Amino acid sequence: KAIPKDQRATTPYMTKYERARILGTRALQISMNAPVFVDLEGETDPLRIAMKELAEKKIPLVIRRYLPDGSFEDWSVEELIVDL
Amino acid sequence: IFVYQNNITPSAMKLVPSIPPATIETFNEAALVVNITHHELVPKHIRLSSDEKRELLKRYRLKESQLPRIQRADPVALYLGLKRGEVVKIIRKSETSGRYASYRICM
Amino acid sequence: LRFGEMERDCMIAHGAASFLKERLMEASDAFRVHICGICGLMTVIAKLNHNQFECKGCDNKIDIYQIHIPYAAKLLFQELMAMNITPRLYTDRSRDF
Amino acid sequence: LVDVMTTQGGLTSVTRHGFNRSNTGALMRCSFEETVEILFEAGASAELDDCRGVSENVILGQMAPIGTGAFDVMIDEESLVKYMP
Amino acid sequence: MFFIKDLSLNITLHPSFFGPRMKQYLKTKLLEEVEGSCTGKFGYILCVLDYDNIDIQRGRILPTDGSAEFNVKYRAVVFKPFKGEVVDGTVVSCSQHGFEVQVGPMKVFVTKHLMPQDLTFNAGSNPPSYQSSEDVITIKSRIRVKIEGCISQVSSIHAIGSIKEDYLGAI
Amino acid sequence: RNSLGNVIQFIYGEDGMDAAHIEKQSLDTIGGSDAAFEKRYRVDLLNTDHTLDPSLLESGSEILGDLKLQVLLDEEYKQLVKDRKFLREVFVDGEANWPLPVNIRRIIQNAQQTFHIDHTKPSDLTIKDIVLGVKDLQENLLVLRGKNEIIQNAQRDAVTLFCCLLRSRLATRRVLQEYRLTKQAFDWVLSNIEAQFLRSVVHPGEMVGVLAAQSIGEPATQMTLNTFHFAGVASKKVTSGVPRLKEILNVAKNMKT
Amino acid sequence: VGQQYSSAPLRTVKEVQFGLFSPEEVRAISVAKIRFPETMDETQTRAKIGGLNDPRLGSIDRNLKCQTCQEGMNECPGHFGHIDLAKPVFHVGFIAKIKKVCECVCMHCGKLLLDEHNELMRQALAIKDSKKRFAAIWTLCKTKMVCETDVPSEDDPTQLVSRGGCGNTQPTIRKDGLKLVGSWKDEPELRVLSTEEILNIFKHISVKDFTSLGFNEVFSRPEWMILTCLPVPPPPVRPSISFNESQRGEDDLTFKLADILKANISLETLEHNGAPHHAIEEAESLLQFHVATYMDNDIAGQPQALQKSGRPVKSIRARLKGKEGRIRGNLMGKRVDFSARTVISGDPNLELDQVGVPKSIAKTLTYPEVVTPYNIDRLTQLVRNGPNEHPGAKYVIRDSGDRIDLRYSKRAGDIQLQYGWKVERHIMDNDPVLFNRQPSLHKMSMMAHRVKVIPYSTFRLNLSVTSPYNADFDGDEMNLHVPQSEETRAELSQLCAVPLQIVSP
Amino acid sequence: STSTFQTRRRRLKKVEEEENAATLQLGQEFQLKQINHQGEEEELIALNLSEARLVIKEALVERRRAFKRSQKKTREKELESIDVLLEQTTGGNNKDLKNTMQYLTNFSRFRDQETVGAVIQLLKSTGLHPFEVAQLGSLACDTADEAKTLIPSLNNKISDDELERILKELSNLETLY
Ligand SMILES: [Mg+2]
Ligand SMILES: [Zn+2]
Ligand SMILES: [Zn+2]
Ligand SMILES: [Zn+2]
Questions:
Q1: Residues G7, E37: contact at Cβ < 8 Å?
Q2: C8: closest CA of chain H, how far (Å)
Q3: H147, H163 in Cβ contact below 8 A?
Q4: Nearest CA of chain H to the CA of G11: how many Å?
Q5: Is the distance from CB of F41 to CB of F75 less than 8 angstroms?
Q6: Same domain, yes or no, for H6 and H78?
């Protein structure tokens, strides 16, 4: 249904399932020969690269969180607080 | 509220739903002898105004049906005389977290 | 090797959404098929060269889709049609919720 | 478990005669004790399946809304720009 | 009769083109798979307007491959004739069976039998033509037809028309 | 919820905590005589025999008397109290040990030797520091988030049983005379708890249904069968074991016992 | 999957709209006139008759042909053919309802037996749930056994109002075998309910009457529980089995159909020749029998419809029936590729998260990697290394979607890899794997592990990870599945990893 | 394909596809009441030759400009000036657009975005349906009979006399060559 950046309600944190898919999803793309927005300090593993792409929060993705009723809340990996 | 003793004539009862709006109920004596709602296990329910509900829903993105239900003939459903639609707010004690809200629509 | 119900329930428990889809498709059955955007069936006559498509009856050519479902599923669905039952497969939801 | 049994109204058993008759879509119930029977009285009453239940997907080999699949992911082209020196 | 219908479309993109100027490649790929297409449903997709404000929205990553997919909503000018529409165009081909006139991107044929009586066909001519007590219709002459029927075909839409009625013919 | 949309807990486990982060901590508040309870959490700044001996707090002697603090110092007490009652109305058994996120017994043991605190020299905490902080702490152990009442109310609930342990532990009389914490240590202990808690929450995804299921059947499988330890005393025979569990899940009318 | 690109757009299934086949569609969909019951032998000539299985449907003999559709064998879901029945039949499974329905409607004019007028009714006509709004309406009509012509309205029980006519008494009904019999009363009148009639009635049931009863105006009218045109499933459903040439072994299903077909003909031929009036219904039951025993064969009406040799027969239903069958046996649990299994033992020298795989397996299991500048060097290296030296590979694949059997292919040693190609390589130290022991009823029965290629043929694990699997080294076989994507191996790494599992929920 | 802003819930039985004609009955995709991307309601967009010519040009032109913002890092006379614009922003194999531009550029009736303006402002006071306002805008007409015959969807929808005052002021605005 769409939810404004405001009136936001979900967790401010990142569900492990979220991270893991992102991480996976990214690495996949990296190995798909995709642009990598960080200095590979000499990394050759798409995951490892993704993990870096993440600890510098430079991953162009937005998790769209869907709610039982259909409406969703979009959260970027830039925002999402990565504790774990 | 009508309180019979041994029973009512099946010829009689079929006259209650013949004068709306007004509503009628029927309890046996041996029934009311003890107030169940005082029972260790039964926790307090509560009726909710047709607004506190239109809210509960809104605030939970709930479709009427997705809500836990209570039997029209449920002991406590009677003790508070609910109607097809009214919602009750069962508030119990929890070993996980002292209190624990919960709700129940009425089918 | 058999990746059975039990090993299934276990993945679901873990939350490994895709490592599951895999074990089930990309690692076993997996098959592609052409559905009609109208009578949600395995009808459609796919001549994967001249692109020609058709689904006379629900008489199509235009509205056509392609999907990914284990072979078993293709089978099942047919087996059912075999038993006069029609399991329509749609790609867009109309009921909402 | 308990909460599952109750809710509905009274005591919904954990058996073919109970929970597997609920407002849950076909295929999902289809996947337990009554299989063919179920399906029959499904296409009979023109059932319609959400395809929201694990089983629903595992049977169509799709990614089921579950942890990893409890959400969609996307590329914000706008944040994709600001990511280049 | 030409139209401006609002449309959309889906484009699967590879992680490859996931650059800083992705938007670009899209609008591009759009125009590649759009302009010059045909559908008995929409007619001839001729041109995409407002190239600048093409809505891409956010695109979603797929699940097995990182390809993304956006639903690009746009707007273009179209054209799809109708069985009753009166258009005029320039003739192109001609034969013993009647000539073919071209109106817009589409070619509307005309059976020798669907035109007037007093209009015989001349072959010993060059270029070939149809002669009348006072009219003469050959290759370059401009005619005004009355589309009597349409026919959708792969990537085109031909039609049969006439000039038997009144106010129809050469100009 | 389930594949439909039907709720089945408006909060997993009625507390939104993930099983992984929980242990048997004790509710000191419940057990014990009305006598000792006072000798522990009771602080009276207006009394030679019921005030914090300055050998503990830095601003100890310049407190004995302040009437503005005995307003807080008391707001605290009337609470650990209101608590005691609440609990005994829940855990009637008297049982004080329960499964609760954030092990606070340890979180402090760490705070202890991590700053090499010495049981000789006095603290440096304002009594305002303690109470007014432990109060802000709970303000952040958010489990639910909503911007409205309904929810912000359910929050206070899913949090309750915990705080009680919290306050039970972060008692002004406790904090100083029991474990010599310092502004630092304290402020630390508060930091971790806010987190260790926040981490203890459950992740919106976790297929609990199946998890739940598994966890009952696992042990279900190991259950002995048709044993009856009573046999040898017929007439005092009762149905116990797997046949019983069968009986349940089945929702059987004619139960053996 | 399925190889060969297709303009067709790729989507997912969102809804599953179960319905019932209207004879009209059955024909519509159908491509085979399916007249003859024979299989092939165009008088022995090997091929297929434009009769049963392929009068256009799918094929066999490794021949594209499938109505030009070509694509042959793999990449072509059979197509449905039809087979017009001579006289309508019951649907083994639907007999149940077909009956109950009648009990819910009087014949002749075919209409409900309780309008808005009878009050007990209303209370039913409101329950939204076609599943109970039915077993309710029925509970209220199995009793009414007279199509009332007039009933007292909402006013005086003295004034009578009329609705639908004809009160022709309704007959009570009982299920005998596969037919429906009802009685009329004063000394009953027992006559069999001809399908030809039932159908009619149903056909005459109203739109609002459908709906009111658990039905649907578009996908499932009751009139469709009675079979009129039988959909004939194509080959891939009832595949044969060839012992080279001149030796063919067909499928059970193909046989029933045959018998159904045979039976059908022998019936038709009886209505266009010496028709001994009631000597026909003696073979109409045979049709019904086969047309019924084909879908189901485990009924109460004893006759198991055996097939010479005492072999029961495999009813379509018999295939889906749980455990070992279609739904629970092929879908909820599949056998899978990239799986391994051997005896296990204890290694006090591995890390907890590790699992010592023996070389033998590493060299057999392959993780399809993607050729990328990050790897090209190291990758090609393997390729060269062949599929026999450990650190190696055993297939390379080009964008053209084609395999390169590194163990043969003349250009084995050759090959210059390419950005965008893939190299199914050997599992190497540290690849994330899904280790596990059965039976699985614990999250901790399947945990990811760090691979660690080793000698000797036994999977190696760390003692302290014995209990989670609850295994002993008394010859305990364990399994192992290998991830395949990059995202997949990530779901095992970031979620199912042994160390992530140390605290049990 | 290329979806068209309206998801008509097709329930299996797809049979009703009415005819198409000058009974102003155009396919579903072209009712006067169609939906805009923003999600509002908007009248059908009927373009008359020359009116289309301009519209396409406009876009083709302004596309060029934006096509270079990113590169930094008289009858027979228009045929040529255009071919270039195309050999500039078009895909090249858009043979369709080409032929269209000629037709469009040869049969048009208005050069100025101003005369075309008056045309519109004039016709859009007839309340006629877009497809008439279109045909009426790109088809020479002297008598009403001539118009009302070629465009039958009129007939009764407007007195003969008035349609004639409309055709009288069309010939006048009819730009010269
Ligand atoms: Mg053993
Ligand atoms: Zn179709
Ligand atoms: Zn084929
Ligand atoms: Zn009747």
A1: no
A2: 35
A3: yes
A4: 13
A5: no
A6: no
Q: Resolution in angstroms, to 1 decimal, for this deposition?
A: 36.0
Q: Determine contact, residues H116/E48, Cβ cutoff 8 Å.
A: no
Contact G505/F at CB under 8 A:
yes
The verdict on C58 touching H (C-beta cutoff 8 Å) is: yes
A and H interact (at least 3 Cβ pairs within 8 A): no
Q: Which residues of C touch F (CB under 8 A)?
A: 9-10, 12-13, 15, 97
Residue D33: helix, strand or coil by DSSP?
A: coil
Q: Do residues H14 and H34 share a domain? A: yes
Residue C66 lies in a domain: yes
Which contacts (CB < 8 Å, 24+ apart) does range D12-17 have? D12/F251, D13/F249, D13/F250, D13/F251, D14/F249, D14/F250, D15/F249, D15/F250, D15/F251
Q: Judge if H35 and H64 occupy the same domain.
A: no
Q: How far apart are CA D60 and CA A2, in angstroms?
A: 28
Strand partners, E170: E143
Among candidates F24, G29, A29, H107, which has minimal Cα distance to C56?
A: G29
Handedness of CA G195, G197, G199, G205 (dihedral sign): negative
| Residue of chain C minimizing CA distance to E63 | C18
| Structural domain harbouring C25 | 1-85
**Nearest C-alpha in G relative to C73:** G331
User: C95 lies in a domain?
Assistant: no
In whole angstroms, give the CA distance from residue H52 to residue H113. 11
Residues lying with their CB under 5 A of ligand 4, a single-atom ion: G 106, 109, 147, 166
* Judgement on whether residues H59 and H95 belong to the same structural domain of the protein: yes
**Domain containing residue H3:** 1-46
In the reported structure, the alpha carbon of residue G121 is separated from the centroid of ligand 4 by a whole-number distance in angstroms of: 18
Neighbours, chain C (3 or more CB pairs < 8 A)? A, D, E, F, G, H
Looking at the fold, whether H30 and H96 belong to one and the same domain comes out as no
Count the Cβ atoms, other than its own, within 10 Å of residue F234. Answer: 8
CA–CA gap between residue F245 and residue F226 (Å, rounded): 11
| CA–CA gap between residue G257 and residue G336 (Å, rounded) | 33
Strand locations in G281-350 (E)? 334-335, 339-346
Per-residue tokens: C44:
């459609």
| Domains annotated on chain E, with CATH | 1-84 (3.30.1490.120), 85-171 (2.40.50.140)
Burial of B54 (0-12, 13-18, 19+ CB in 10 A): exposed
Give the other-Cβ count within 10 Å of F119's Cβ: 6
Residue G57 amino acid letter? L
CB F231 within 8 A of CB F257: no
Residues 6+ apart with CB under 8 A from F39: none
**Are H89 and H62 found together in one domain?**
yes
DSSP-assigned states of every residue in H23-90: SS---GGG-SSEE-TTS-EE---EE-TTHHHHHHHHHHHHHHHHHHTTT---THHHHHHHHHHHHHHS
- Looking up tokens 């999600």 gives H39
Q: How far is Cα of residue F140 from the mean position of the Cα atoms in its chain?
A: 16
Chain C closest CA to D59's CA: distance in Å?
A: 6
3-state helix, strand, coil in chain G (%, to 5): 25, 20, 55
**Tokens in use for G222?**
């009751």
Q: Within this chain, do residues H52 and H108 fall inside the same structural domain, yes or no? A: yes
> Is D67 within 8 Å of chain G by CB?
yes
Residue C97 inside a domain? The answer is no
Sequence-ordered list of residues with C-beta below 8 angstroms from that of G231, at least 6 positions apart, any chain: C81, C82, C84, G21, G26, G29, G30, G80, G81, G82
Same domain, H61 and H128: yes
Q: With touching defined as 3+ CB pairs under 8 A, do chains B and E touch? A: no
The enclosing domain of C52 has a CATH number of: 3.90.1800.10
Report how many domains make up chain C.
1
